[model samples]
Target: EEPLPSWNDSAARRAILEYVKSVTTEGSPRFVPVSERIVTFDNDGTLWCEQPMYVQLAFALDRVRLLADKHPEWRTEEPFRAVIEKDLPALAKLGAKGLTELTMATHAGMTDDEFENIVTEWIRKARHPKFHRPYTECVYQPMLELLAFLRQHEFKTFIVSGAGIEFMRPWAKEVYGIPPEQVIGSSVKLKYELRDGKPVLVRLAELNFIDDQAGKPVGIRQVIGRRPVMAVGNSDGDYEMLEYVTSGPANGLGLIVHHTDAVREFAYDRQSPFGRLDRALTDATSKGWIVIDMQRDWKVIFPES
Candidate 1:
């Protein structure tokens, strides 16, 4: 069977195949060392659907409700009230700061293991409101094939996302086949401490690093040390990552996942609040970055159950 069966025979698929061939073929001018065959992927919209709101945001909202009974004061609070009342418009009016507050409240004050269990449990049961399927099942089918294809060519695949690193680590390995160490994302600070008689890493409420936009490249440099040979993403937040990857001397490949299938998934770009794809989409062609249109390039949006 051909690789990328979920991908249509189109320019995007051809570009991906050609790029992998050029880099993996020995003696080719674009040939790269196996150690340097690192590829980064954005998790949200690139590998899965990120419409309505980010999956992490959905988790956060759910966390708020899950913990609400413990804090009676939240019934009158701006953001918490909005969440408890299911008032999305009010929550939107509160903006990023409100979301951050909610995130800190729900994501912190727990041991790393505790947080992991919470995330694992939540993700297992959580369903996408629109799809009514478990969030893991909402992942793009073509992207899964692409990851496998890259791995077959001796390329190391890493997920570089804007979501919380710890949050993703709990489920990414099972969902994407990428290990915990290979996942990089925004993070909360961690502190080592002894609880009872055991040492544990406690997740602090403060932000450590946001692995998005310019931070994406910085995170790659700090963690991976080597520039990746390929990068895939879906939002303007991935602009710097694409730029950094493709600017390397190794003839890097950059791909942008453009949401353009309302029937299958969603048709959004340039104006959507979540996973906005304006600046990156505009510069894709000029920068030689391949844009994968959901409608035209993907044969299927989600994996078959």
Candidate 2:
């Protein structure tokens, strides 16, 4: 059976096949044991579309709007006011700190279960701006095939993303076939307490981790406890992750999904605000990492609606 039918017959496809075969074949010098076949993937751009804005960020913005009735002051607040008014330019000027404030305002002050339900509900209704499909449906078809193909070969797939762990855990399995435990990501602090005789974890409005750029490697080491044999990502945020995985002695593979197809999918690399693929794209070839050009390597971008 063809493992990656959505992938074109290109060097990127050949490289992935060759690398997986060499590592999985027993008795070969490059062969890796089942226990060591750990593979990590970034969620936002690597697996799904992260153009214009991240799905999680979109969720946060929507949450701000939903909760606006309770906090009437948000109508006059800088970032909140901008979000309510759909003022992109104003929001951009407020920058990362403003985004962080929005995230905390929307994501915290709820029980873990409540947060999960919120995310589950939001993802179901939320649609991508351009594609007009549910964000989950905007996932790259070739990447999905790659994920299943790796799992078929006994590789343990993990989503190591910069998106909130709790935010992704609710629907990750439904979208990516990756279980919650295998998903490592940035998180907010939580408090353990009893609520009406039931033990509950209350989400706090404080940052716990930011699992992007250099933090990716740290998150992996802290959570997985083992260096991965393969790492796949898009953007400079994943630079350290690919570097860490490929630096291992197990002939580790590093693959980068370069968004180059503007027609089938939105294309922005070095200049894009979300998932900027600058340094990683520049260094991929030099580091022996395979760059899967979305324009040339992927026969299809998103799965059929």
Candidate 3:
């Protein structure tokens, strides 16, 4: 993709441009310095592809199969059954809780060091079934560029999503240049402990928090503190996040990257099993959120994939 005119044509573009200029340039009316310019991005459909199957789901299923020998009952469970049978409908029946359970089982309940080892190993070996490429290699090119571009402007970019934080932290810095500390997502319980007179945090599979939709804004306040000046997401799961960022604000950007390219990539809205878009359509229009059409706005989709 070639560099185009400074983001002047679209509202989303203009909003980001103004914010970047305000914070980066030292002598602007809106200047606030780079240190305070905070931007939050949702991972799943925002940072990379979350279609066909969420990459983490594939990872969890693999872990489930490996651990099935220990807990034989999972072989007959709803999600584990669907995993082995490759039945999406049966798995969807479990919905968010089932997904969370899978996440916790695959993640959590280990030392942070152990969790990192487990997650990083999974990402290193994980591959898209059809493409036969590492899942990390399938990230959206435009978004990747946008992330680097924002960093160049000195805007601190963070990944805030419903996707498990631990699952994304391992590779987020390597792939997106957003470090683990800046990556925020749904989290399982963490227990404080003393090991041999040393303080340590034990990661547990118990539910701690759900950071999606309204939880997104909650997570922002709890984790990020300051309201982000820029927020980008794709599904209704990010509705409250976009709202919280742009709610009657003077300097804020609420951008939604909608997946509408069926050819280069999957086009889905209110239909796709993954990253479904519904209220996002109506809210984007009524609220004037910058809705990014993957095919239209983006000159390229996944790089060569």
**Candidate 2, TM-score vs. the true structure?**
0.94
Once fitted onto the true fold, the runs of candidate 3 whose alpha carbons sit more than 4 angstroms away are 1-15, 93-97, 106-108, 194-200
Supply the TM-score for candidate 3.
Answer: 0.89
lDDT of 1 by residue, 164-241 (tens): 787789888888999999999888788999999999999888877778789899999999998998999999989999
lDDT of 1: 0.86
Q: Which one wins by TM-score: 2 or 3?
A: 2
lDDT of 2 by residue, 20-112 (tens): 999999897888899988999999889998877878778878988888899988889778888899976675443333454467667677899
Question: Which portions of model 1 miss their true places by more than 4 Å?
Answer: 76-78, 89-101, 248-250
Q: Which stretches of candidate 2 lie over 4 Å from their true place?
A: 75-78, 89-101, 248-250
Score residue 197 of candidate 1 by CA lDDT. Answer: 91
TM-score of each: 0.94, 0.94, 0.89
Candidate 1 is scored at a TM of: 0.94
